[PDB]
Design a protein around this ligand. Structure first.
Ligand SMILES: [Co+2]
Ligand SMILES: [Co+2]
Lengths: 227, 202, 227, 202
C-alpha cells in the first residue's frame, strides 16, 4: 500500500538525531517492554500472526497521525491489537472496555500466571526463528547480471515493493531462492513463495542524481519484468 | 474534536500504554500468555542480545584471514555455526567496507535489523529522517554522523525489504598493531556495523 | 520537494468525511479568520510573499506531524510566520516571545488601528488578482496532441510536479502560455516564466489500472521531455 | 519530550492560535497591517463570495445556449465579463459533464479552488483522504458521495497543479420543465460544481 510508512525518497523529515550508542537507551517506559513481549509471545504461538508479514501490515494500516506520533513500540501495540481482533483471538468491544479501564485506572493490578512450558515455546521462536525460505518447482525467471525493469504496480494491500524503486531499471545481483511472498502472506492468503532477488539500482536511475551512490533492494519476482 | 477532522488528533501515548496493559491482561486471563513468557522475551532483547556479538565477528575477521574469507563467502553458514542465529537473524549477510566502497544499511519500510547479531536497532534507525534520506542522499546523511567520504568512494546503501538482513564489516583502523582479538572487539562500535561510522584509531 | 503534502496516489488516509454543504461551516475559531486576513493582508502588499509560490513552500516545509495536525489554517499561520521571518519583515526572537505572551495570556488586548488607504490596497488584490501569465521570446517546445514523457526529477525545493506523474507518458492537451515558474519563484529566484501545458494521463499509465479514468495535470515545460 | 523524538509531538492547536495573535499584534504595531484591512479580507471570504456565483453561471448556461457555447469556448473572457474574477480566480476553465464524461476537480498538492466563482472550498476538499484517493480511484471516492457511475462513463480528474482553476458544468436534471433561470440556479449545488455529485430532479 502507498502509506506514510514507505518513506524512502521523501523530503521534510529533517535532521537525524544522532546519539552516542552508550546513551541510546532501549526502553524508557514499561509498556514498550510489554510491547516486545506481546509480539514475540503471540508470534511464537501463531496467535494473530505466524510471521512478520501480518505484523507489518497492521503497522502500515495505522492512521498516519498515529504512525508519526505513537513512538516506535506504539506501532507494535497497534499491530498486535489489529491482528488479534482480526483473527478473532480477541473481541473488539472487550478490548476497548479493558483499555478504558487502564486509561481511567492505570494502577489496576495485572493478574499473574506462570507457565514454564510456554517459556520453552517462546524460547524456541527466539533461537530457531521463522526462516521464510522454501523450495518451489518453478525455475527463476531472471539471472545474475540481467537488466530488469521493475513494474509500475500500486497494490492496495501489503507489499515490499517500495515506491522509490517502482518503474526503474536495475540489475540482478543475486537469486536468493524462493521466500514466502509478503503480498499474500500478510493477508493470510497462503505462503505462495516466489523467487527473491537482490537488485542493484544506480542513483542516476532512481533520482536523476549522477553520483557514485547505489541502492541494493530485495524484490520478489512478480515485482519485475524482463527487458 | 470536530467530526470532519478526527484525523487531526493522534492517540496520546497514554492510550498506547493502556492498550498494551489491556492486551496483556486479556491474554493472561484467557491463557494465551503468562507473566514469565513476557519477561523471558524482555530479558532476551534488553539484556541477552547486543552489538557485542557482531563485534566478536568483526575482530575475528580482522585477526583470522581464513575466517574473514569463509564469512564473506557464506556468512549464513559461518554465523550460524557461531551461535548467531534466531528470530530476525535467520539469513544474515556481511558486506565488506573497502577503501573505495562504503556500505550502509537501512530499512526504509519499518526498522528491520539483525537482532541475533547486533541486538536492538538505534533509536534513529527506526525514525523517518534516516529511513527517507539515506537512500537518496547517503553523503549528506553520513556527514551528520561525522563521516565525510570523498567523491571517489562509492556508497552502496542496502535496503532490508525482505527477511534477508545485512551487517557491515568495517575496516580495521590504523594504530592497532599488536593488540589482541578481544581488545580489538572493544573497538568495534554498533554504528560502524550499520555503516554510519568508521572506527577511529584508539 | 517530496513531502507529505504531495498525497496524490497514497493509501491509508481513510474515508472522505462528507458533510452536506449547508452544514459545512467555514470557520469554527476566530484565529482561522485571522489567518485569512494575515495571508491576503500581507500578500496584497508584497510582504513575505509576492504571490502563492512563496506561500506554498512555507506550508510544504512544515514538520510532517504539524502538517497532518495543525488543521487547515494552521498551515496558513505557519507559512506566514516562515516567510515574514525569512525576508526579515519580522525577527524570529521577537515573534516567539510574543507567541509565548498569548500562550500564557490568551486575553491580551490586540491594539487597534484604522488605515482606509490600506483597505483600498487590499481590495485591489482581491478584485484584480495576481495572474502569473507572462510573455517570453522563446517558442513552446511541445504542441497539442504530442506524446511526451515526464522527467524523473526530485527537486529538493518547491515544485508543482507531483510524484504520481513523474516518469509517465502523457499527451499535451493544451499550451496555456508562459506562467511564472513555481520552482524558482517560491525561492525568490526570479519569475523566470516557462510555457505551461495541460497534460492528459491514462489510468493505465499512472497506476497500472486499466479503466476509463484519466488525470489532467498542468506541467511546466522543464518537467517534460519529447519522445 | 525525549529529545531523540521531538517529531513525535505536534504543536497543539493552541499554539497556532497564539502564533496567529502574535503575528497580528507585531504587524499592527509596525504599521504593516491594520484592524480594518484584516476585517475587510474576512468580510470578503466569509460573506461576499460563495457558490451562488457559479450557480448563476450554470443556470445561465442552461437557459441560454449562445452563452453556454461562449463559456466553453473561452471561459476566462466570459467569466471576467460577468465580474467573476479576482484572487485565485484569474484563469478559470469550465469543463462540461456529458452523458459519458464526468469531471471532477482536486488539488492534490494543497487546496486550490476558484474563490471568485465558487467561494471557499469544502472542508473535505482540503484534507488528505480526498486529495490522495480521487486521482487513483475516483469511482470509489464518488461512491462515498452517493454517485455510483457506470463502467461506461469516463471520469476525467483535473488536478490544479498551476494557477489555472477548474469549475465543472453539471447536467441539467430531468423534471425542471418551465422553471426560470433564477429557480434553476437554486438547484445548483456547490458539490455538482466540483463534480462529486450530480443534480437531483426537484
Ligand atoms: Co524494518
Ligand atoms: Co491547492
Amino acid at each position: 500500500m502507498n502509506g506514510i510508512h514507505d518513506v524512502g525518497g521523501m523530503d521534510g523529515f529533517g535532521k537525524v538525531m544522532y546519539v552516542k550508542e552508550e546513551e541510546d537507551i532501549y526502553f524508557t517506559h514499561d509498556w514498550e517492554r510489554l510491547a516486545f513481549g506481546l509480539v514475540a509471545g503471540c508470534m511464537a504461538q501463531g496467535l494473530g500472526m505466524k510471521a512478520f508479514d501480518e505484523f507489518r501490515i497492521g503497522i502500515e494500516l495505522m492512521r498516519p497521525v498515529d504512525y508519526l506520533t505513537s513512538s516506535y513500540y506504539g506501532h507494535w501495540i497497534a499491530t498486535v491489537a489489529y491482528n488479534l481482533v482480526d483473527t478473532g483471538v480477541l473481541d473488539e468491544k472487550e478490548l476497548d472496555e479493558r483499555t478504558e479501564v487502564f486509561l481511567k485506572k492505570p494502577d489496576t493490578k495485572i493478574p499473574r500466571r506462570e507457565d514454564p512450558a510456554l517459556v520453552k515455546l517462546v524460547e524456541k521462536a527466539l533461537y530457531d526463528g521463522l526462516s521464510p525460505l522454501r523450495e518451489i518447482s518453478a525455475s527463476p525467471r531472471f539471472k545474475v547480471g540481467e537488466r530488469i525493469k521493475t513494474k509500475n504496480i500500486h497494490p492496495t494491500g501489503h507489499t515490499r515493493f517500495p515506491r522509490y524503486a517502482r518503474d526503474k531499471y536495475g540489475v540482478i545481483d543475486e537469486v536468493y531462492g524462493a521466500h514466502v511472498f509478503p503480498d499474500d502472506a500478510a493477508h493470510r492468503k497462503g505462503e505462495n513463495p516466489q523467487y527473491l532477488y537482490r537488485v542493484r539500482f544506480e542513483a542516476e536511475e532512481l533520482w536523476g542524481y549522477k553520483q557514485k551512490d547505489s541502492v541494493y533492494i530485495d524484490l520478489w519476482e512478480s515485482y519485475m519484468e524482463p527487458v | 474534536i470536530d467530526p470532519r477532522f478526527p484525523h487531526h488528533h493522534p492517540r496520546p501515548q497514554s492510550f498506547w500504554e493502556a492498550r498494551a496493559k489491556a492486551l496483556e491482561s486479556l491474554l493472561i486471563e484467557k491463557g494465551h500468555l503468562s507473566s514469565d513468557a513476557i519477561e523471558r522475551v524482555i530479558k532476551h532483547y534488553e539484556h541477552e542480545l547486543g552489538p557485542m556479538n557482531g563485534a566478536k565477528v568483526v575482530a575475528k575477521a580482522w585477526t583470522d584471514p581464513a575466517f574473514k574469507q569463509r564469512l564473506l563467502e557464506d556468512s549464513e553458514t559461518v554465523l550460524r555455526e557461531l551461535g548467531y542465529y534466531g528470530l530476525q537473524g535467520e539469513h544474515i549477510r556481511v558486506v565488506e567496507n573497502t577503501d573505495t566502497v562504503h556500505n550502509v544499511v537501512v530499512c526504509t519500510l519499518c526498522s528491520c535489523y539483525p537482532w541475533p547479531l547486533l541486538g536492538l536497532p538505534p533509536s534513529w534507525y527506526k525514525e523517518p529522517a534516516y529511513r527517507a534520506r539515506v537512500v537518496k542522499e547517503p553523503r549528506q546523511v553520513l556527514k551528520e554522523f561525522g563521516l565525510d567520504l570523498p567523491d571517489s568512494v562509492e556508497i552502496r546503501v542496502w535496503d532490508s525489504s525482505s527477511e534477508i538482513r545485512f551487517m557491515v564489516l568495517p575496516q580495521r583502523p590504523e594504530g592497532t598493531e599488536g593488540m589482541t582479538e578481544e581488545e580489538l572487539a572493544k573497538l568495534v562500535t554498533r554504528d560502524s556495523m550499520i555503516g554510519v561510522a568508521k572506527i577511529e584509531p584508539p
